[PDB]
Structure 1
Amino acid sequence: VIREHNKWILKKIRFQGNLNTKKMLNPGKLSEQLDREGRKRNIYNHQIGTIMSSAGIRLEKLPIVRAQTDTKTFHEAIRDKIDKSENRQNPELHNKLLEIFHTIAQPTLKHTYGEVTWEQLEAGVNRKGAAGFLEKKNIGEVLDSEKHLVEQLVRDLKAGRKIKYYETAIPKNEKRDVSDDWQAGDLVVEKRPRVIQYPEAKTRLAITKVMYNWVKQQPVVIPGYEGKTPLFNIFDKVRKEWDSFNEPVAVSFDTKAWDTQVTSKDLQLIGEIQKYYYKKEWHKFIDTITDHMTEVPVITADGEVYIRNGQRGSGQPDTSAGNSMLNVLTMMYAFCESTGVPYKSFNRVARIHVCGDDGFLITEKGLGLKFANKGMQILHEAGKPQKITEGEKMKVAYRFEDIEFCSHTPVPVRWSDNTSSHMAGRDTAVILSKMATRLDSSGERGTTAYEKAVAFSFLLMYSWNPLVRRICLLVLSQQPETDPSKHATYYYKGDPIGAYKDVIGRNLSELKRTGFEKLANLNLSLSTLGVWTKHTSKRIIQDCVAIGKEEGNWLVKPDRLISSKTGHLYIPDKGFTLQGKHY
């Protein structure tokens, strides 16, 4: 019941309001927002978002929220997770971890690794890499001017001279999932931030420059390290392994705040394993840097200074390999300690998959459930505590289809030629949540050029999800007269629908059927959290049908369902997939 001269604003409201105002009209919310520096930008990706809004998709209900980046809570964070004594660990642990290491060392590479060229280092590096605190220039900026400085540092570290290592701590500015939360009463509006602690831009360069091989895992030498493999065919290889066992089972790793749990001795162990693969001319370097990481001086963004007793500073270059290697060793060790399986017999009774602290292992029911029970406690005294759940034991998968890994589970996908396979799945709500909120930060603002790349990228990753697929298509369907932006995860050269072939190996038009069950499960939060309406499915479909009925080769015909309905198929052309900003 507002006044007339004031109803013009109403035609600008795009979403339901969220002020919860009890005695003042809250008409809704707009699609623009005030940038941290006065600017007025979009909140979402306009194109993708507009289409989502065409159907009953309330972008507002997406389980996503900004992270509290304010000093008061940032400090709470550091106090809550980081402020802790080093974990006590059974004595001999590290001997046995080393022992286990030797059962998985690749002699063909022992003492072969050394420094690498500036050229291979700068391989799509993140020039916008943070800069330090006491440091002026950032990565890239450092490449250009102070390069030679990096060199003397390397040289300094090698000589093992004195250095002023310290790490900067800052809350991470990112939108986060609250899908689990909202799914349950708790309708949080923001979430604690991840606190990043990281080495100086120059130091990061020196480090990654000589340890490129171990850090980037060029020559993956970590058993089960799967963060080098593309998420579209990963569950396929795991599928194999699963089928090889009689009555398989997957046990999931679930350590609490892993980084905060890394011991000093854990760090030294990695030091050893690193010296195992590096030419002797670098062992002092390795020892030197490792001696520093056992007690790091951290300077918070606000100015505070705390002396952290060894843990993993997410920003350390070695984090990925470091945590992955240390994680597999500990879990293997844990498995053995639990079942009775001798160390060298690991690879014969089980298969392990890891990605940083995340990971699981496949094995015969018996051995797996054993690992699952005695596991918690063994792990607990190993210094890597597992999250208390309810059935006081590790999560056990009895169905391959239930394996959770790297934030995904497998998704069944039948192809035209009745052949099958598995794609990487996730909650649609979340796919949508990332689709509408990912903008190019490695840039600023938005263009259909960008969204097109975004759509393409999600096509490669989620073609099994109809909703998403048709939305991606509708996106790609626009401005064909313009090539994609290279600021996305991926991007195509030539014809998109082609490239999907170029990478997936098959044709989109061939995606005949997606597991019904896996899909019903992956669509729950959509209803439960009120993200979509009943009509949404139909709504988006017609949206395609419309474009795709006119005479022509419509790239929206690859949906076997839309194609059917339009009476037109799409005839692909060129198309070769590339990369852009993918980690």
Structure 2
Amino acid sequence: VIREHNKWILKKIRFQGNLNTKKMLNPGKLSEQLDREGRKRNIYNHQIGTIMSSAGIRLEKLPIVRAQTDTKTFHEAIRDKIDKSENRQNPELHNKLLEIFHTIAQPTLKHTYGEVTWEQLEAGVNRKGAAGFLEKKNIGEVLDSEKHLVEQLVRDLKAGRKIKYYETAIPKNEKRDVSDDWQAGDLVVEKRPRVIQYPEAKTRLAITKVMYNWVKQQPVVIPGYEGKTPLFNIFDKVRKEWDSFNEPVAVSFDTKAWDTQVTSKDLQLIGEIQKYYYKKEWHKFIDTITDHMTEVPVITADGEVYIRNGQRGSGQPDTSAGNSMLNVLTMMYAFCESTGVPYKSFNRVARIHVCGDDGFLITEKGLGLKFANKGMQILHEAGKPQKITEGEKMKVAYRFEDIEFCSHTPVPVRWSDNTSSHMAGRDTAVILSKMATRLDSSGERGTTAYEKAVAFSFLLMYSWNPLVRRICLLVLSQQPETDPSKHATYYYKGDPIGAYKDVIGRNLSELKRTGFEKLANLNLSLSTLGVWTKHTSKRIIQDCVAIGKEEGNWLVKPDRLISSKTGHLYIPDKGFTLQGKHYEQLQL
């Protein structure tokens, strides 16, 4: 019981309290917070957050917390992962790994790679790209002015000269999924930070500029490199391979802290593979740069300095390519050595998919489990320790939907024309989490021109999720005469629904059904964690109907269920899908 002149505060609570105070009342949390600089910004996306709160969705219950950027733990991070000797690896590992590479190399491109125009390096670049402990300017600023300094770096490197190489190590500030944790007792309030180790935004532009093709894997030369592959159509092509086996089994790759496991010889092996695709003139640039990465001096954000014995530095330009190639080769290596299947014969009995250290392969039940069992040991001595599990063997999948990749598994979808396909699935709880806390930082206070680009982006990815799909449609119904933001993953031109068709291949309205028992599972956590109420679904459905009832062409009617209830369809006008300020150019 609180005093009257104090109840006014209550008009502002928007979430249950988390203080867990025991002798002092803790009414609730407010919708806003305080900037690291004192300002008062929002926690979630307004439009989206509001719609979700309409139904019994409790934003405060979404498995999402921030990472601890404090130095105390930031150091505990370095000490717990990066502080390690290099993994002992069997002798011929790198010879036999190189051997496997040659069985997959394309002679057509051998020694054909060269430098690139500032005009393509500049394409899609994240300008606000870090600076480096001893560097004043960031990417963009370097691009604006010191563009010349970068050209001599390239020269000094091509000539294999002196270069004071070093990396800055800072804890990555970001919100992290804690779904698993909360699903079990551990109600963590925040999670350990990832240490980003990176070159100096000059040395970055220098390396990237000449090695654009390998790094940006334009001609994709890495077996099963799913890196430039949009996520919303990968399982369809993977379903193909699955269906091409008699008793298919999928085995996932689970290296514990990949980056932390790359050896010097691993880095050298990629150096070689790199020299295979680059013209002889650049081979010294590669040797010089590779030589430095074998032992890097690292300056932490607070001043400390450690001499890392070259593992991988997340901020290095060659992380995606390097890690991927190195991953496939090592997995291919392990597989063959476990089954006996000749290196050269891999593609005869197996199909592989890799994205960094993330990936899996598909083979017959026989070979597959022989690999999962003998792979633990073989990989371990190869220097890529697999996460220890109760099963004692690599994670095997006997069902297609049980295939996990890039934090997603295949969700079955039934189209109106009685055909099927699979989309990228994930626990709803998490989709909703990321959809509510993704705030774009084109710094801006965010529009409704950004929340639309986000909803559109989540539409392409999760149309198979009714709840999520409808939330998007509602957001997209707002302010029709205001184009979407380009600061989201994808954005659209013309009609959103028209655009959906553009990349998905089918129209939203043609989406007739979602695997019952798959969707069912992906919604289980929503209750365990009490994220929604037994009326949310109903409510969101009503929210939609309301809008699409009256005669007119409403973009909320592309949802079959809503359509049948309002009796109206939605006739799309053309639309086109596009990326925004990009990471790795997806080839849509």
Secondary structure of 1:34's counterpart equals coil
Residue 439 of structure 1: aligned partner: 439
Q: CA offsets per residue over residues 235-264 of structure 1, 9 Å max, x none?
A: 011000001111010000000000000000
Once the two structures are TM-superposed, the CA of residue 98 in structure 1 deviates from its matched residue by 0.3
Q: Mean alpha-carbon deviation: is it higher for 166-175 or for 569-578?
A: 569-578
Cα distance in structure 2, aligned partners of 1:138 and 1:582: 17
Q: Percent identity?
A: 100
Cα distance in structure 2, aligned partners of 1:92 and 1:496: 54
Q: Mean alpha-carbon deviation: is it higher for 444-453 or for 318-327?
A: 444-453
Q: CA offsets per residue over residues 319-341 of structure 1, 9 Å max, x none?
A: 00000000000000000010011
Secondary structure of 2:202's counterpart equals helix
Once the two structures are TM-superposed, the CA of residue 23 in structure 1 deviates from its matched residue by 1.1
Secondary structure of 1:94's counterpart equals helix
Q: CA offsets per residue over residues 348-375 of structure 1, 9 Å max, x none?
A: 0101100000000000100000001010
Q: CA offsets per residue over residues 170-206 of structure 1, 9 Å max, x none?
A: 0000000110111100110000000000000000000
Once the two structures are TM-superposed, the CA of residue 7 in structure 1 deviates from its matched residue by 1.4
Cα distance in structure 2, aligned partners of 1:262 and 1:296: 13
Asked whether the equivalents of residues 413 and 422 of structure 2 are also in contact (C-alpha less than 8 Å), the reply is yes
Once the two structures are TM-superposed, the CA of residue 481 in structure 1 deviates from its matched residue by 1.8
Cα distance in structure 2, aligned partners of 1:186 and 1:444: 34
Cα distance in structure 2, aligned partners of 1:577 and 1:236: 19
Cα distance in structure 2, aligned partners of 1:121 and 1:538: 49
Q: CA offsets per residue over residues 8-55 of structure 1, 9 Å max, x none?
A: 111111100100011111111111111111111111100000000000
1:459 and 2:459 matched: yes
Q: 1:526 to 1:582 in 2, by over 3 A?
A: farther
Asked whether the equivalents of residues 87 and 383 of structure 1 are also in contact (C-alpha less than 8 Å), the reply is yes
Asked whether the equivalents of residues 224 and 353 of structure 1 are also in contact (C-alpha less than 8 Å), the reply is yes
Once the two structures are TM-superposed, the CA of residue 343 in structure 1 deviates from its matched residue by 0.7
Cα distance in structure 1, aligned partners of 2:316 and 2:394: 29
Secondary structure of 2:16's counterpart equals coil
Asked whether the equivalents of residues 232 and 460 of structure 2 are also in contact (C-alpha less than 8 Å), the reply is yes
1:309 and 2:309 matched: yes
Asked whether the equivalents of residues 297 and 307 of structure 1 are also in contact (C-alpha less than 8 Å), the reply is yes
Cα distance in structure 2, aligned partners of 1:9 and 1:2: 11
Asked whether the equivalents of residues 427 and 522 of structure 1 are also in contact (C-alpha less than 8 Å), the reply is yes
Asked whether the equivalents of residues 170 and 197 of structure 1 are also in contact (C-alpha less than 8 Å), the reply is yes
Q: Mean alpha-carbon deviation: is it higher for 572-581 or for 105-114?
A: 572-581
Secondary structure of 2:551's counterpart equals coil
Asked whether the equivalents of residues 490 and 581 of structure 1 are also in contact (C-alpha less than 8 Å), the reply is no
Cα distance in structure 1, aligned partners of 2:285 and 2:19: 55
Cα distance in structure 2, aligned partners of 1:159 and 1:582: 32
Cα distance in structure 1, aligned partners of 2:579 and 2:276: 33
Q: Mean alpha-carbon deviation: is it higher for 561-570 or for 262-271?
A: 561-570
Asked whether the equivalents of residues 124 and 582 of structure 2 are also in contact (C-alpha less than 8 Å), the reply is no
Q: Mean alpha-carbon deviation: is it higher for 46-55 or for 480-489?
A: 480-489
Asked whether the equivalents of residues 440 and 446 of structure 1 are also in contact (C-alpha less than 8 Å), the reply is yes
Cα distance in structure 2, aligned partners of 1:579 and 1:369: 39
Cα distance in structure 2, aligned partners of 1:494 and 1:366: 50
Q: CA offsets per residue over residues 472-513 of structure 1, 9 Å max, x none?
A: 011001111211111111111111111001111110011000
Q: Mean alpha-carbon deviation: is it higher for 78-87 or for 490-499?
A: 490-499
Secondary structure of 2:275's counterpart equals helix
Once the two structures are TM-superposed, the CA of residue 216 in structure 1 deviates from its matched residue by 0.3
Once the two structures are TM-superposed, the CA of residue 582 in structure 1 deviates from its matched residue by 4.1
Secondary structure of 1:42's counterpart equals coil
Asked whether the equivalents of residues 255 and 384 of structure 1 are also in contact (C-alpha less than 8 Å), the reply is yes
Give the CA RMSD over aligned residues.
0.7
Asked whether the equivalents of residues 125 and 581 of structure 2 are also in contact (C-alpha less than 8 Å), the reply is no
Secondary structure of 2:321's counterpart equals helix
Cα distance in structure 2, aligned partners of 1:272 and 1:536: 56
Asked whether the equivalents of residues 499 and 576 of structure 1 are also in contact (C-alpha less than 8 Å), the reply is yes
Q: Mean alpha-carbon deviation: is it higher for 434-443 or for 58-67?
A: 434-443
Once the two structures are TM-superposed, the CA of residue 442 in structure 1 deviates from its matched residue by 2.8
Q: Mean alpha-carbon deviation: is it higher for 197-206 or for 435-444?
A: 435-444
Q: Which 4+ residue blocks in structure 1 deviate beyond 4 angstroms?
A: none
Asked whether the equivalents of residues 488 and 582 of structure 1 are also in contact (C-alpha less than 8 Å), the reply is no
Cα distance in structure 2, aligned partners of 1:582 and 1:205: 16
Cα distance in structure 1, aligned partners of 2:154 and 2:445: 38
Asked whether the equivalents of residues 169 and 299 of structure 1 are also in contact (C-alpha less than 8 Å), the reply is yes
1:317-396 aligned at under 5 Å gives the runs: 317-396=317-396
Q: Mean alpha-carbon deviation: is it higher for 361-370 or for 6-15?
A: 6-15
Asked whether the equivalents of residues 57 and 531 of structure 1 are also in contact (C-alpha less than 8 Å), the reply is yes
Once the two structures are TM-superposed, the CA of residue 119 in structure 1 deviates from its matched residue by 0.6
Cα distance in structure 2, aligned partners of 1:145 and 1:177: 39
1:102-141 aligned at under 5 Å gives the runs: 102-141=102-141
Asked whether the equivalents of residues 490 and 582 of structure 1 are also in contact (C-alpha less than 8 Å), the reply is no
Asked whether the equivalents of residues 125 and 582 of structure 2 are also in contact (C-alpha less than 8 Å), the reply is no
Asked whether the equivalents of residues 327 and 356 of structure 1 are also in contact (C-alpha less than 8 Å), the reply is yes
Once the two structures are TM-superposed, the CA of residue 444 in structure 1 deviates from its matched residue by 2.5
Instruction: Normalising by structure 2, report the TM-score.
Output: 0.99
Q: CA offsets per residue over residues 371-399 of structure 1, 9 Å max, x none?
A: 01010000000000000010100000101
Once the two structures are TM-superposed, the CA of residue 401 in structure 1 deviates from its matched residue by 1.2
Secondary structure of 1:359's counterpart equals strand
Once the two structures are TM-superposed, the CA of residue 576 in structure 1 deviates from its matched residue by 1.1
Secondary structure of 1:271's counterpart equals helix
Asked whether the equivalents of residues 62 and 433 of structure 1 are also in contact (C-alpha less than 8 Å), the reply is yes
Once the two structures are TM-superposed, the CA of residue 524 in structure 1 deviates from its matched residue by 1.1
Secondary structure of 1:432's counterpart equals helix
Cα distance in structure 2, aligned partners of 1:484 and 1:92: 54
Asked whether the equivalents of residues 17 and 27 of structure 1 are also in contact (C-alpha less than 8 Å), the reply is yes
Residue 269 of structure 1: aligned partner: 269
Once the two structures are TM-superposed, the CA of residue 581 in structure 1 deviates from its matched residue by 3.1
Once the two structures are TM-superposed, the CA of residue 514 in structure 1 deviates from its matched residue by 0.5
Asked whether the equivalents of residues 443 and 487 of structure 1 are also in contact (C-alpha less than 8 Å), the reply is no
Cα distance in structure 2, aligned partners of 1:579 and 1:98: 36
Cα distance in structure 2, aligned partners of 1:296 and 1:544: 56
Q: CA offsets per residue over residues 265-298 of structure 1, 9 Å max, x none?
A: 0000000000000000000000000000000000
Asked whether the equivalents of residues 154 and 207 of structure 1 are also in contact (C-alpha less than 8 Å), the reply is yes
Once the two structures are TM-superposed, the CA of residue 443 in structure 1 deviates from its matched residue by 2.6
Once the two structures are TM-superposed, the CA of residue 6 in structure 1 deviates from its matched residue by 1.4
Residue 226 of structure 1: aligned partner: 226
Q: CA offsets per residue over residues 88-109 of structure 1, 9 Å max, x none?
A: 0001100000000000001110
Tell me how many residue pairs correspond in the alignment. 583
Structure 2 gap ranges (5+): 584-588
Structure 1 gap ranges (5+): none
Q: CA offsets per residue over residues 47-92 of structure 1, 9 Å max, x none?
A: 0000000001100000000000000000000000000000000011
Residue 556 of structure 1: aligned partner: 556
Secondary structure of 2:170's counterpart equals strand
Secondary structure of 1:446's counterpart equals coil
Cα distance in structure 1, aligned partners of 2:582 and 2:496: 18
Once the two structures are TM-superposed, the CA of residue 433 in structure 1 deviates from its matched residue by 0.5
Asked whether the equivalents of residues 126 and 582 of structure 2 are also in contact (C-alpha less than 8 Å), the reply is no
Asked whether the equivalents of residues 65 and 177 of structure 2 are also in contact (C-alpha less than 8 Å), the reply is yes
Once the two structures are TM-superposed, the CA of residue 574 in structure 1 deviates from its matched residue by 2.4
Residue 46 of structure 2: aligned partner: 46
